[PDB]
Amino acid sequence: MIRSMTAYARREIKGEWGSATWEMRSVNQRYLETYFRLPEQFRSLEPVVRERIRSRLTRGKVECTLRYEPDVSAQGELILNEKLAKQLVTAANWVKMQSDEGEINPVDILRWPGVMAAQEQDLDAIAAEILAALDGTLDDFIVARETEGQALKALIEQRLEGVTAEVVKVRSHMPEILQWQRERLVTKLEDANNRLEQELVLLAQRIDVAEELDRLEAHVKETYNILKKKEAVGRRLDFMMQEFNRESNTLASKSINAEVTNSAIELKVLIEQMREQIQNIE
Amino acid sequence: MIRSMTAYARREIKGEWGSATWEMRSVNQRYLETYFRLPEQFRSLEPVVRERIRSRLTRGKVECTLRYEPDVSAQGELILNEKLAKQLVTAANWVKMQSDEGEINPVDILRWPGVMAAQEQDLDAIAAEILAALDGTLDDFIVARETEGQALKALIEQRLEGVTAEVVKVRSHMPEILQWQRERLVTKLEDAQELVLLAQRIDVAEELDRLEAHVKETYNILKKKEAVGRRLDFMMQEFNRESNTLASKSINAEVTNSAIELKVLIEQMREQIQNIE
Amino acid sequence: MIRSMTAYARREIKGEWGSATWEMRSVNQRYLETYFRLPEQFRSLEPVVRERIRSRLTRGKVECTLRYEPDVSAGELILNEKLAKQLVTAANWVKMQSDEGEINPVDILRWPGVMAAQEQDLDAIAAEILAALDGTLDDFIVARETEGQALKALIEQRLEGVTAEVVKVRSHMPEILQWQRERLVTKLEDAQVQLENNRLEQELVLLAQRIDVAEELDRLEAHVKETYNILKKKEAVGRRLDFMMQEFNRESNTLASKSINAEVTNSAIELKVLIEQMREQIQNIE
Amino acid sequence: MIRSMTAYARREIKGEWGSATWEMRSVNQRYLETYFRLPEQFRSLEPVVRERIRSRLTRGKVECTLRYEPDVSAQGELILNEKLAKQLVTAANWVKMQSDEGEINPVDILRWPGVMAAQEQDLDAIAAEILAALDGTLDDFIVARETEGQALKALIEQRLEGVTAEVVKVRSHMPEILQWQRERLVTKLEDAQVQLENNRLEQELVLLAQRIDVAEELDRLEAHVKETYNILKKKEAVGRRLDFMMQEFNRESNTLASKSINAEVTNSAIELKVLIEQMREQIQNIE
Amino acid sequence: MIRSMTAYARREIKGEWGSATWEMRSVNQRYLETYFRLPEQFRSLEPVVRERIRSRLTRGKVECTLRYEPDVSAQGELILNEKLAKQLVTAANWVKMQSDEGEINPVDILRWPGVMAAQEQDLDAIAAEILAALDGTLDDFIVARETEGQALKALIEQRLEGVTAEVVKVRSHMPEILQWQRERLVTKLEDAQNRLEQELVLLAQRIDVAEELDRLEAHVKETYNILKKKEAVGRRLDFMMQEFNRESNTLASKSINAEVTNSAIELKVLIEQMREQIQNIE
Amino acid sequence: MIRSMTAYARREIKGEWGSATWEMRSVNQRYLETYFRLPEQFRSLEPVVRERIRSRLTRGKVECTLRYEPDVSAQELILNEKLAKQLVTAANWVKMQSDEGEINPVDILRWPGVMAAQEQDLDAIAAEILAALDGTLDDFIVARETEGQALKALIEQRLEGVTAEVVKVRSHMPEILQWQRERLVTKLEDAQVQLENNRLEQELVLLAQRIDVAEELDRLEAHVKETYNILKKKEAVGRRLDFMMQEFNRESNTLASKSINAEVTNSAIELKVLIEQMREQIQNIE
């Protein structure tokens, strides 16, 4: 069950206290990178949310944003500190006697800190519900990372069927070609004995690609095994494609017929198509 | 039918609610890279945008930008908390009694946090219209790719004709090639123990026949509906292989000059293929 | 010793003056960058906090914040009468230049320092705050040292897996060489061609040299032994480990290129996976 | 071509929107590090700038700063939301009826968010101009590296000439020293003792000549300067290959100073070790 | 009065202006390397503080850090920038001419940045107080060096006592040693009269064990004399241990007696143990 | 005129445009490393300051910081008149909707962008900054030469001790060479080894010429005379002196190895001590 690095998932929780929205987005990356945007009230929640994200995700760049819109009507009714307000008025009266002018503004006294305050302090209860909501949107994020990736797995397996069908097309042509190479050489040597076949068969071992086709088939069987294991295989699959293309290039190099060369090109096209999908794999 | 990797297309939809613009540009790239610049309100549309673009475009580095301009009257309405405003006015009246002076500033009451708030309009009907404009931008984008791709197809076909013209030109010197072919073989016999005269490959007719089939295959590749950019690049490497083998053989001035011209045509074709998806 | 460049540590100190909790976190960054979020009362403490943090922390992007809430302590406040008179006389000079204006009393009280809390002394709170800061920093260093030791165990776990893949390849190597020469003679027996004297031996020597990977395997084992030595000596560990990974990777690529067996190729891929896993942890090293 | 890892490049473009300045500074470093300091508006351009620089530059430590100056007066005329302003005034009128007093400040209405908003100028045309100025700065930067590399090569070749001058300075002085050492031995021996079998004298003179002989290290120093000039001629892996020669240069100079029986030869060996250190200063700057 | 290179000392001075703290720590080094961490206000003190550390210390790697913590006080008078205030009033007059109305608030002009500037603190009186605290820290740093240095001196003298004790153990075998020395000479006289070469004169120079023990006992009495010196003797004692090993190399190389060989090995173990402690002596 | 690598120099200048301070400090380094902390207005001066410093400094790690404090326009502030008119016209529109209000002038000035960037003649100021850099750079070298003269006196004081130890060994050497003739022949008589008569006497003095340290003392005295000559060079001689001390230490080790007398061994140790003391002063020499 392979997963992809790029996915999106947003969840919004509505309550009397307020509305909070968790958004998670991700893009392909070489290593895991985490970025968190949180409100000031839930800034203390940043270490807790980072451990959950990092434990669940092995690789990829993920940005998580939480936006809290509290309800001011559900906010507790404001209390007026009468002693502090009188303490500020008598202080301003002293300033007015020094300046011999000025007028106290009532709104400014209310704006002074501690004069009008709210003591709801319900943040701890809603934070536990936000943490439970974070696990829900993180599961929606993981299920989206696992939804796609099954499609990527099918695309790679479809190309893996194309490379194995392409080597059997080379396997049938090759013995016919090996005999043809001896014939054209003999006609050229018209102007030129025993043990000439001894040098021919050693040259034919350099032309033969059976050992290389065997390795390529072994790499395909391994690639099927790599897709089934449940771990990070994004980079391992990329290293495997370098060996796929290594055998394709040495096959196109030792190719002496145009039919085999066209098959080697088809192999390299399928490898490029697989490498494009492996980039999206974690 | 082949599509160039670089193209540009913009579409703007105007309505009473506001105006939005879909700008989309692309450049050449080995694999498909999708970068989206979307407003915070339409940030949720990003997975839907990626689904539509990735399905339609096989390869290339594409950047898509969306900019939304809301009408100043639309998506705009003030919500005034009447109870909280009355609470602040009565609290300020109490302060005015202790101070025996002062005047309540109205805008200061509005700037109090809980007093003023803005309502959230339903962007669902707009988002569906913004999403439909993206489909139209993709249609204008792929046709601009096909228009530039047809010019690249003509340049490659024009130089494929010069490749075949050079292959026929060396086959006029074919009788001289056979003379030089046998003469090289007998001179090595004259020089004569690890005598691998068999290992020497001097045949050039197979190289020309093998190269001539690649040209016929290249025309067939250009007719394909799927992406052909990477396949043509691999094909040029085989064009270069047969030119490199023909390059090693020094026969006469006309043959060597034709081999030089062949490699120039391949490089000119390979430069245009980098622009092909 | 080695220290993990990313770590977290917070501490809360409660007192009669109020409650203040120091919280500092770090992420892996190529340079030292300290961002502080301090209250207005402790805004003057910004320079001394920066010097103390940067003296013990050599590298990394650190975000340190302090949350402070004043305690009413059940309402009387002190008034800086001299500072208020200083501002009124300074405003009177401005009024004579402008020839207009009125001094707002609340605006004078809004000036910093004009109003102060009687229940608390700012200098006494700052001394407790500064003493709490170095306590968080000392625990912050330990949080880096413990997680740094965790990164060391990860690299050693992958190093022993690297040296296990090398001896796994060298066990297959003699069998592979004999399989290649036996594959050659079987085709000569099928072809019934007359065998020549020492022509076979010279071809066997040539292929043996092409498949020979002895220098790459010995060079890989020298790299793992050097990596343990670099990991033991705790001087410039973060930089010197980066160079070893490039040497590990080019020997693995050279091995994968010169390989003729699919099983050896699979082992070379495993090496490159282990190298990539080691590189991921080396970035976290300070 | 050899290129110095220390250079400075600057490029300024003038436009109606303002002026943009690029600055490049490079310091020697074993790895390739690139640090970028861009404005908040063009912070999205960093991954595009990083690709062009990392692809065109070899190893080193590079710092990039982009300074963007807005004209302010020439562009960005403020637009007034008349509908929102009237909405706030009617809302404030309601509060005025409740309080039965107050006065609406006009500038307070303008300072309300969204009332007076400047139209955002599309930075697409300006960012393309900045990207075009970047590759022009990289061109000046590469040229500066190549011109400084030629200066480092001249300094290395200048010291190499001083190395050969010291080697032949020792070679001419060596036979004079070997004759004086023979003349001293026979004089000390004849002063207090008799000649010993004649052939024993020749044996001791041969042993003495072998101990003071430095011709092997002296010939090996001259072989090192010829390979060093060839290495400078080669433009492939010049930095890694040139470090090895300095250790070999310093190896032969140390063994030469150890076998130096004459003070003028020892001073020449020290001058060699000074020239080697001066060459080592330039090689850490090259690739 | 020998001193160890590793030592630590701190001092804090308190005043109404604030509090400052010096902190010195050192480790072993071949030469003297000093590193200073100073506040930006007292950066100018770096050349002065270096000369003082340099005067009382000869070798070692010290790191000297200074923490300056001024008390947070708004008591400092704020200068009224009369120039800038007049610049703002004339600018506001222009706005009044355009609007044809308005009034300049004096408090708002004061709130404008730069109009009220805090008086620069003359730290000359504080710097002299901080420099005086450095002298106290250096004095505490030196006594910490001398305290640890006395323990090293006692440990070296204990090892020197074992050296002389092992010498006496070999001195008893001296009549047996002189027999073995004479046996080496007569053994080299083999096939005596075909090569005209006499290694006997050379061998008499190489096996002068009696002079080694005498010269070794002279090095011990000199080592005691070196410990009583006032100047730093760290490098001198290390050079002395090289000579201790030279006199004991012949005893370990030649097996005159199994008991003598054991005593020679213990003799070289003591030299290595003294070498380890001399690393810590300045 | 030798110069120490560690030095400090700080200069402060005042003008109508403002006040700026150059600060230069340096420490020991193998080669020359220059780092610059410059304001944003004078970041363009960095390539000019670098060539100026590198011209007069041969090696060392030097940090060069410049603090520039701008002064408000003394003897008028530039004001965006069109933006201010646009805000007054917009406020007038609000005043007719509300039918009340008064435009506060300071509130218009507080608006972002109304106060344009203040006029500064950066070209005329930078020329004064460059002239102050030269003064600080010349003031920096005076601090180098002052400390260097102290290092020169310490080295010359130890060089006098070297020649004093050399002549002490020189005087005792002819006596000790005679003592070995009588010492070696006595050991031969103890074992009753037959004398070779004249041939023994010849080999004895040939061996004595091998033990004779007079050749090492002559070379060492020539190195002392050369070290005085090196101290008079105007160029940097920090590295050359270090290479010279290696030859000092080479002859001393050869002296201690060939030593046969405890007093000569103690004198060789005194030589090695003086050489280490000179090396400690030399490590600070440019």
Contact B95, A110 (CB under 8 A): yes
Asked, for residue E1, whether it belongs to a domain, the answer is no
Write out the E strands in chain C.
Answer: 8-14, 18-27, 33-37, 61-70, 77-79, 115-117
Structure tokens, C28: 């892996």
> Are residues B86 and B66 part of one domain?
no
**Chain D: residue nearest C240 by CA?**
D30
Cα–Cα distance measured from residue D27 to residue A84, given in angstroms and rounded to the nearest whole number: 61
> Are residues C171 and C99 part of one domain?
no
- Give residue ranges of E with CB < 8 Å to any C CB: 37, 39-40, 65, 67-69, 71-75, 77-78, 80, 82, 85-86, 89, 92, 103-111, 116
Cα–Cα distance measured from residue B104 to residue B14, given in angstroms and rounded to the nearest whole number: 44
Name the nearest CA neighbour of C29 among C284, C265, C252: C284
> Are residues C157 and C142 part of one domain?
no
Residues of chain A neighbouring C81 (CB-CB closer than 8 A): 94
> Are residues A162 and A128 part of one domain?
no
Domain count, chain A: 3
Residues of chain B neighbouring D127 (CB-CB closer than 8 A): none
Structure tokens, B208: 């020309």
Asked, for residue A1, whether it belongs to a domain, the answer is no
Cα–Cα distance measured from residue D124 to residue A167, given in angstroms and rounded to the nearest whole number: 50
Cα–Cα distance measured from residue A282 to residue A235, given in angstroms and rounded to the nearest whole number: 8
Asked, for residue F215, whether it belongs to a domain, the answer is yes
Give the nearest partner residue to A72 out of B32, B84, B181, using CB atoms. B84
Residues of chain E neighbouring C112 (CB-CB closer than 8 A): 74
Name the nearest CA neighbour of F1 among F141, F111, F196: F141
Name the nearest CA neighbour of C87 among C69, C68, C113: C113
Cα–Cα distance measured from residue A105 to residue F198, given in angstroms and rounded to the nearest whole number: 124
**Stretch (H or E) spanning F66:** strand F60-70
Smallest CA–CA distance, residue A55 to chain B, in Å, is 24
Cα–Cα distance measured from residue A236 to residue A222, given in angstroms and rounded to the nearest whole number: 11
Structure tokens, E219: 């090095």
Contact A229, A58 (CB under 8 A): no
Structure tokens, B260: 């030089």
- Give the burial string for A103-129 (b: 16+ CB within 10 Å, else e): ebbbbbbbebeebbeeeeeeeeebbee
Single-letter amino acid, residue C183: R
* DSSP string computed for F246-278: HHHHHHHHHHHHH--SHHHHHHHHHHHHHHHHH
CA atoms within 13 A on the CB side of B91: 22
> Are residues E132 and E107 part of one domain?
no
Contact C31 D35 (CB under 8 A): yes
> Are residues B90 and B133 part of one domain?
no
Q: Cα angle vertex C196, ends C194, C197, to 5°?
A: 150
Residues of chain C neighbouring D63 (CB-CB closer than 8 A): none
CATH number of the domain bearing residue A160: 1.20.140
Cα–Cα distance measured from residue C260 to residue B80, given in angstroms and rounded to the nearest whole number: 79
> Are residues C24 and C140 part of one domain?
yes
Contact A281, A233 (CB under 8 A): yes
Cα–Cα distance measured from residue A62 to residue A128, given in angstroms and rounded to the nearest whole number: 23
Contact D87 B78 (CB under 8 A): yes
Residues followed by a break in chain C, C–N over 2.5 Å? 74
Contact B106 D102 (CB under 8 A): yes
Please report how the helices A82-99 and B82-99 are oriented relative to each other, as an axis angle in degrees rounded to 10.
Answer: 50
Provide the number of CB pairs (under 8 Å) joining chain E to chain F.
130
**Chain B: residue nearest A74 by CA?**
B114
Residues followed by a break in chain A, C–N over 2.5 Å? 192
Residues of chain E neighbouring C108 (CB-CB closer than 8 A): 107
Give the nearest partner residue to A92 out of C10, C106, C196, using CB atoms. C106
* Max Cα–Cα distance, chain A, nearest Å: 129
Structure tokens, C195: 């065998």
Cα–Cα distance measured from residue D181 to residue F77, given in angstroms and rounded to the nearest whole number: 87
In the block, residue with structure tokens 């290290």: D217
Contact B98 A77 (CB under 8 A): no
CA distances from F252 to D251, E232, E242 (A): 21, 20, 13
Alpha helices in D103-236 (DSSP H): 106-110, 124-192, 199-212, 215-233
Resolution (A): 2.8
Name the nearest CA neighbour of C221 among C154, C155, C166, C152: C166
Contact B116 D91 (CB under 8 A): yes
The set of residues, in sequence order, having a beta carbon less than 8 Å from that of F35 and lying 6+ positions away, is F61, F62, F63, F64
Cα–Cα distance measured from residue F245 to residue F253, given in angstroms and rounded to the nearest whole number: 12
In the block, residue with structure tokens 């109404």: E16
Kindly tell me the sign of the dihedral angle through the C-alpha atoms of E82, E87, E92, E94.
positive
Contact A66, A130 (CB under 8 A): yes
Write out the E strands in A15-60.
Answer: 18-27, 33-37
> Are residues B20 and B98 part of one domain?
no
Contact E77, C86 (CB under 8 A): yes
Contact F104, E96 (CB under 8 A): no
Single-letter amino acid, residue F260: I
**Percent helix, strand and coil across chain B, each to the nearest 5:** 60, 15, 25
Contact A3, A149 (CB under 8 A): yes
Question: Which neighbouring-strand residues pair with D55?
Answer: none
Q: Residue E40: phi, psi to the nearest 5?
A: -65, -35
Cα–Cα distance measured from residue D107 to residue A276, given in angstroms and rounded to the nearest whole number: 57
> Any idea how long chain D is?
287
Residues of chain D neighbouring B116 (CB-CB closer than 8 A): 91
**Chain F: residue nearest E45 by CA?**
F8
> Are residues B163 and B189 part of one domain?
yes
HEC secondary structure over C202-246: HHHHHHHHHHCCHHHHHHHHHHHHHHHHHHHCCCCHHHHHHHHHH
> Are residues B99 and B59 part of one domain?
no
Structure tokens, A164: 């194995």
Residue E20: which domain range? 7-72+125-144
Cα–Cα distance measured from residue E33 to residue E59, given in angstroms and rounded to the nearest whole number: 7
> Are residues C214 and C277 part of one domain?
yes
Strands C18-27 and D18-27, sheet pairing:
unpaired
In the block, residue with structure tokens 């099918």: A154
The set of residues, in sequence order, having a beta carbon less than 8 Å from that of C127 and lying 6+ positions away, is none
> Are residues B254 and B183 part of one domain?
yes
Cα–Cα distance measured from residue A29 to residue A6, given in angstroms and rounded to the nearest whole number: 9
Cα–Cα distance measured from residue C117 to residue D114, given in angstroms and rounded to the nearest whole number: 38
Residue E190 per-residue DSSP state = -
Distance of CA F279 to the CA centre of its chain: 14
Structure tokens, F123: 């070209």
The set of residues, in sequence order, having a beta carbon less than 8 Å from that of A44 and lying 6+ positions away, is C23
**Chain E: residue nearest C114 by CA?**
E74
> Any idea how long chain E is?
282
Cα–Cα distance measured from residue C231 to residue C234, given in angstroms and rounded to the nearest whole number: 7
Residues of chain E neighbouring F6 (CB-CB closer than 8 A): 50
Contact A200 B198 (CB under 8 A): yes
